[PDB]
Amino acid sequence: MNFGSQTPTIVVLKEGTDASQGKGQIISNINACVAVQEALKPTLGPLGSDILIVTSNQKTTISNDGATILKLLDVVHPAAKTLVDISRAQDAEVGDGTTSVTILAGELMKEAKPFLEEGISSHLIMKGYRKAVSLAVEKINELAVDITSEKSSGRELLERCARTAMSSKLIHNNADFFVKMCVDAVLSLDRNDLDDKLIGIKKIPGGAMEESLFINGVAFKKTFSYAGFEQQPKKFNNPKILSLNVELELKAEKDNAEVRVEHVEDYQAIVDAEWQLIFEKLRQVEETGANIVLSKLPIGDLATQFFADRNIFCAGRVSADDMNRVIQAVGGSIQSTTSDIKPEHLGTCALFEEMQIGSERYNLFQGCPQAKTCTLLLRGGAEQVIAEVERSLHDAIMIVKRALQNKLIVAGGGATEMEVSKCLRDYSKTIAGKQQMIINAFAKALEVIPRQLCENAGFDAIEILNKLRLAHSKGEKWYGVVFETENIGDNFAKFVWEPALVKINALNSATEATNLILSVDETITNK
Amino acid sequence: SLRLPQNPNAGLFKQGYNSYSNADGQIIKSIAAIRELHQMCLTSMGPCGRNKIIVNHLGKIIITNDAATMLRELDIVHPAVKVLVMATEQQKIDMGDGTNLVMILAGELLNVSEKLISMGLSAVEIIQGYNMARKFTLKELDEMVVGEITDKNDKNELLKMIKPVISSKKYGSEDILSELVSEAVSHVLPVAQQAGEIPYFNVDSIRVVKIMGGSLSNSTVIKGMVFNREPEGHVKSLSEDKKHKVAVFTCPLDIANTETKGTVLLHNAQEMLDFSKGEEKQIDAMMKEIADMGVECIVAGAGVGELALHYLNRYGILVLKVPSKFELRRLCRVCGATPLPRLGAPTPEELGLVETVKTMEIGGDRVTVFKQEQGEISRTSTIILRGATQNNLDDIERAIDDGVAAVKGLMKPSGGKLLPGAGATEIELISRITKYGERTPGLLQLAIKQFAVAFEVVPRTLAETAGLDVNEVLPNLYAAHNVTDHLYKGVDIDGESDEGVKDIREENIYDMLATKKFAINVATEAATTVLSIDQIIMAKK
Amino acid sequence: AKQHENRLEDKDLSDLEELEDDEDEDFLEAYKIKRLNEIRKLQERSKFGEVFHINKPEYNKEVTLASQGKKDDGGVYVFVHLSLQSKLQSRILSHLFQSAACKFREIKFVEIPANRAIENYPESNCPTLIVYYRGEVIKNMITLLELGGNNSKMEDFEDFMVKVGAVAEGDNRLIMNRDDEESREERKLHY
Amino acid sequence: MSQLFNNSRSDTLFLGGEKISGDDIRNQNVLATMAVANVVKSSLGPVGLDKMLVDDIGDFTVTNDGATILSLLDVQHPAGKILVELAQQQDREIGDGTTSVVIIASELLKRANELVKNKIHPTTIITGFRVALREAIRFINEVLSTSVDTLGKETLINIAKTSMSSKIIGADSDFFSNMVVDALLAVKTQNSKGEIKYPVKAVNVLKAHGKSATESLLVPGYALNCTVASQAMPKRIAGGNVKIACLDLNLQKARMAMGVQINIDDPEQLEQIRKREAGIVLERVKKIIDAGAQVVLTTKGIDDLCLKEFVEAKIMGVRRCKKEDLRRIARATGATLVSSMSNLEGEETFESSYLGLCDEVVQAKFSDDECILIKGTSKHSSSSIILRGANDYSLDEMERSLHDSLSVVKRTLESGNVVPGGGCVEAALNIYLDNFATTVGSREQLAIAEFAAALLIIPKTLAVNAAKDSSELVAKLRSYHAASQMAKPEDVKRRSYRNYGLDLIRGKIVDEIHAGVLEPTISKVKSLKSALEACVAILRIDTMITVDPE
Ligand SMILES: Nc1ncnc2c1ncn2[C@@H]1O[C@H](COP(=O)(O)OP(=O)(O)O)[C@@H](O)[C@H]1O
Ligand SMILES: Nc1ncnc2c1ncn2[C@@H]1O[C@H](COP(=O)(O)OP(=O)(O)O)[C@@H](O)[C@H]1O
Ligand SMILES: Nc1ncnc2c1ncn2[C@@H]1O[C@H](COP(=O)(O)OP(=O)(O)O)[C@@H](O)[C@H]1O
Ligand SMILES: [Mg+2]
Ligand SMILES: [Mg+2]
Ligand SMILES: [Mg+2]
């Protein structure tokens, strides 16, 4: 009846598919997040340390924020990918607190360890944190004071909040000069339409970072330059900027036109018609007096010798993102027809000068007060000093990006976490149930942000935190820790502020990161 | 007495074929082996259920506490499990609700029938027993209905419909997600005094646009849609025109070229001089007619040329690619226009109306928003999800797909009436089937009793996930049904659940009639096939 | 196993119609729609078909840009010929380019004088055959002694195109696979 | 938890394994402790369940004891070997709390590592534990309870049920508690001028799978597992006052010493030499047969010459056995173990004073086995335990379980003071130490507070093994205990609370006196000290150095 000697049993899952039951896997998932958490533990704070990562392709990448550190390390574990997703989400939405949101997410998982060791299943502890966030977000809104009541100046607001962003970086001593760059850069943008692509920074080598300069114009980097370059004047007084999407090339990328002729006299006409058409396009541009011609697609060789004669500047092979930044500065839009041009579409600038830095030659527009864009030429010692300072000012721009939309001041230095925690402790004592110990653990998890500020500074943490617990018994606000005077005090007197969106999205993202892998008990991996 | 004779039917079917017949023990091998995956769907059941992370061979990670999404990716070698796999997929594609009940019941009928086969009852009689018990179950569910709804238009009436469905998946978010789904259905349904004759509804009406970052409370409803796309040419006016006519062209805006390939032929240089202006005047004759009627937005599916884009920039006409064909027709439903592969000219009857189009960043990426106010819409809506992780937003999409699939399950048939949930009607069916087994004497009475015992997992699975003792609240719940008030007894999930009694109307937990009927039928048909087979023939790899 | 695959793999759109009466329609028409789509792709890719007698400024575009094609990595092979009219092998290779150009319309066939190509090129090394693809030189071929020399034939040139990945092995246009109608006629009678 | 292994360093070149430092060592040491702590965490208490370990030859061992399960788990890590040897030190000394002392040490290293991450030095942490433990032992002296107004052997019965639980034979504790207490009272002796002591492993264990554990027969006397020499001997000696002769003499066709080489010139001497060489042993056995030794005992073997002589007189023979069992037979029967028969005078003899005395001796058949059952000893009483079960692996579980039960009642009689069980000691020491060090203030309040929380892991571990709501019991335990410590001296009811706590069967708070849960005071004494030294040995480690083998 049977087909053969024996019949081995079937494994239900595929051969090699890992699976496990019980409380061991969720503890392993929590320990996996804590293992990723320990890498970013000493990074938190102004006195924190950077992290050096080298991937398989052998490209050095130094960073301080946890957004790109987790992007470099390709994470296999799904539970450890939760910290990576919120870090990119925090980087995409706000742009600040990418390290603290991962530390708070792991600390809630760390404080959930002994409750999971108890018989309480994960559906109780999820309800406690989810109930606590509903009061924490409201308490941050109640502690948010408005700036217009004092009738202060608007220029000093951006400088005050951007000073906090330049901590824990290479800039904190040179922040007196570079904070004016990003504040004046973002103010040139339109308040209604604030764009993230108009703040592109070129990774130009050479030079010290303090030698940079902020200009309302935009640069592009010299392009291919067929013979013709270094004959035109590289300095103009009031040049007219022109942009053309049409490809000025003698049938380079055009489709192959099958020309068929049957006469010798017409062969002289058809070969001169190529010269006749290309010169008609040059003469039409010549009549308008366009002193600076630009194009995304390449410029022909004959045009360079023609524009070199009448001191007309030309450049091609510009990218779409860089060319879009030019149009926001120089006014009129792009036209791809030489006959449909108009004087009114041309731009203008009060000064123009090409100067070399780092053995790179860059064309710089100058004197453009009507420009709704900006540029930054960070100069740096090494290829990571440029990239580190690049993403640092991108985070500084991200603070003033969101500060203009909504103007809310909140405490800093770990103070906002403690006023929220002690309020939840006051709310927890009236519960008298299982949710009391959970909310007290949520209050203990918010205390961790003051810890790493003190651990990286070298001072003992248990003594100073007990001093704050004695200080927060009475009514007090903007009470945290500082490092200059080596003694705690009023942060408002010390003049340090932050936005409220950083703390709100951090608590929601950290709790959502916690509830994702506390609402599971198994991780199956095929293959 | 060392080497066997090697089964002299080895000249028959090759070594890769494996036979696992009965008598040898196939039923015992199967009902058991599948208890591992039965506990997977059992642990993921209820509002306090645990989601399961499934990493496929490609590496796309998913985390979903259902059953259809999990078993689709699991490469399962056991053939008897696969009967339960695609049987659950039938519930997903047809009704979109009841994947887990199907798994905890189809498997429990095989688990509870261990006593029948072990005692020595015939397998053919067990199939006849569950079939007659299936017929009595379908007839009896109609009498226990108390939720006969006839309005099915207003938003507050859907609180008894959508919120029990959303309360199962991620119980913590009820009011927020129900507001998004209920407000979406109100935009989908038309404004009318009496809409009857089975109005049309489809799952493709309500779409889900996933945006990275932002708390779940900051979400909002959009009547149009939102694409991750870069506009080109100009900035919008946003209040000046007050309304915009949008033409949707299937073919691109370019000179009409044939399918067969051609090229440029020029016999003399006189045509060479006019060829540069001929292409400009050709499109100008076709582009000027579009601007006369005031078409302030053009949508071309294929790639738009630079010559056509240049003429549109000066007049301030919005352009958009929309490469995929499925999402191209959904934009036509918003404005209320028809596709036009011909260029032709814009007509007033075929062109729609759009209030405004504005561009910003929601999660850092620039997107195009087609939200309109005071306009007429017909079967179109979107829900902008804000979340911390992409892994969590994937489950919100399927939860919304199951929510709107229930709307398809209501409006497509004549009646999608409610039933008491939270372990209320399941225990009632145990009492009905217990009384039904004594009415018909015969050897099949044992099958009728064991069919009722399979419904016990529904109340206790909510108690097991709640961290409660099954031997206390489950027998205490039977005393509450002794005797309307006895029908609305259910399983409580709270710290005060020591009594084990909570009224259903305080929170309005309800289930669908058609969903449970289709689930019980597919569950019985799934158990009918597994108990009917006796021989299972494998093959190599 | 191969007997089932030879029904579809070893028959073009013209030969697949032989199995219309024998094989099932759904089995046959499902593959004919697949092969019909492949034929349409070759027609769209047929951007060439005669020898492009170019000059140098242009080389920097025709030879190399083309090699990038769409840059969907739509690469395009570009066979260059540094012609030298004094050599006997150069005129032979020029005839092979025009013959192959009429057949393989997707592959670009380029020709230029060798004296105009490279500054002071060795005349002994001519004729030279270069094959570009995505901007990279796939083969820098030397004079045709490898391909028979003076006795080079069209069959040898088509075999070289298969080695560099320009034409598939089982292509119906190659003379090795393009059996004569009289050859297939004798096979059916003797079968 | 440790990932991204430490890089091989070129500036520090040491032979063998690479050096690693930092917090990863204490993380790896705690991770090595959780590898063994999770193994023993499930098999704690009555509700706890144990596991099986195969010996790679088909054999296996189902083990409840912490010393046995860790003995077979040969831990290659250095930090785990400390706890492995601690359990081998724990079970030999006290024989109780082997699972709890490992669980206490694991929880200490957990919170101690957390405190090191909180930036307090380990020296201050160790000082916080020592001052806390010195107050804990002072508090253990306060909560003692002297046995008084108890009817008969009830205090020895119910205290054995606590040790009898957490085993397979806990259901039969009503039957085994009587015989276990009666066994230790049978082997009572005197030593050190009035100090009462009992010998180690004095009661025997015989593996006889058969009828059931309920019908285990308590034979009031000594039992020995030995096969009969000759099957023709009588298996039952009738009449009282049976004399037992214990020997260590060897009686086989004996050989002369090593340095003797016989050399003879006369052929006829071989007849006398061959007979006298055998007949020299007959002079030893002819004297003890005439003395009337009904049943002779011997360690070294006896051969066919002598075996047959013994039978021509209806005397029972005994083959090879252990050296220690014959010592207790001589003590019970009153005989004297003779290594070599001799006399102070110049002639060999055998006296009657060397013979023992017992009422009856019989060879009972335990379903396949020959065992000589001796009962009714005259000089000192004795006892033996007849273990019965389903299979041999259960009998091995019954061996070490009775060895733990016998050891607990042994130390119970050494000190009359007792302490309640069921987490009441750990629950009271938690709240007592939390109140302590509030006046001290500055630094040691956090170290002693986490120390007080470390002792709560035992009532948490017992709860989750029952698969019940754990925090509901922890809320009742700690709160009730606190309400008792704070209370006025003059409040009977509240004071009583100090006495009770967690119950694992019914799941409610009941009195331990009526329930019968009780432990000795010696079990908790020197258990926390061993866990303290176990914590000190790993906590003070900063760097780890490994030398590869040659
Ligand atoms: N001047 C300051 N005084 C006190 N605390 C500060 C100051 N600047 C930054 N901090 C604190 O340092 C912490 C980490 O900031 P940082 O790491 O620089 O930003 P991010 O984490 O977004 O990269 C913040 O939580 C903040 O409270
Ligand atoms: N707050 C609540 N109180 C009582 N019962 C609830 C509550 N929330 C959800 N439930 C119950 O949990 C069950 C989950 O069922 P589910 O498997 O999601 O349905 P389906 O199988 O149709 O998808 C529902 O039947 C519902 O009655
Ligand atoms: N019947 C019982 N009731 C309450 N607690 C008990 C009972 N039996 C044992 N225990 C508790 O279980 C703990 C461990 O007991 P046991 O497993 O016998 O010792 P060991 O830890 O040496 O294995 C003891 O501390 C004791 O308090
Ligand atoms: Mg920052
Ligand atoms: Mg559902
Ligand atoms: Mg014990």
Notes on the protein architecture:
This is part of a larger assembly, with chains A (527 residues), B (541 residues), C (191 residues) and D (550 residues). Chain A is 46% helix and 9% strand. With 527 residues, chain A is mainly alpha-helical. Chain A has a domain at 148-215 and 404-410: GROEL, domain 2 (2-Layer Sandwich), CATH 3.30.260.10. The longest helix of chain A has 25 residues, at 264-288. Helices cover 42% and strands 11% of the residues of chain B. Chain B has 18 helices and 15 strands. Chain B has helices at residues 26-33, 35-43, 68-73, 79-94, 99-112, 114-119, 123-140, 162-168, 175-188, 269-292, 306-315, 326-335, 390-411, 425-437, 445-453, 457-465, 470-480, 513-532, and strands spanning 51-55, 61-64, 206-212, 220-222, 226-227, 246-249, 297-300, 318-320, 358-361, 366-369, 381-387, 418-420, 489-490, 502-503, 510-512. In chain B, helix 2 (35-43) runs antiparallel to helix 5, helix 4 packs antiparallel against helix 5 and helix 7 (123-140) crosses helix 14 (425-437). With 191 residues, chain C is of the alpha/beta class. In chain C, 43% of the residues lie in helices and 14% in strands. Chain C has helices at residues 2-9, 13-16, 25-45, 56-68, 88-103, 154-163, 181-190, and strands at residues 52-53, 77-83, 108-113, 128-133, 136-141. Chain C has a five-stranded mixed β-sheet with strand order 1-3-2-4-5, sandwiched between helices. The two termini of chain C are 22 Å apart. Chain D is of the alpha+beta class and 550 residues long. Chain D has a domain at 219-414: GroEL (3-Layer(bba) Sandwich). Chain D contains 19 helices and 16 strands. In chain D, helix 4 packs antiparallel against helix 13, helix 5 packs across helix 13 and helix 12 (424-435) crosses helix 15 (470-486). At the A-B interface, helix 3, helix 6, helix 9, helix 18 and strand 13 of A face helix 2, strand 1, helix 10, helix 11 and helix 13 of B. The complex binds adenosine-5'-diphosphate (3 copies) and magnesium ion (3 copies). One adenosine-5'-diphosphate is lined by residues 44-46, 96-100, 162-163, 165-166, 421-422, 504, 517 of chain D.
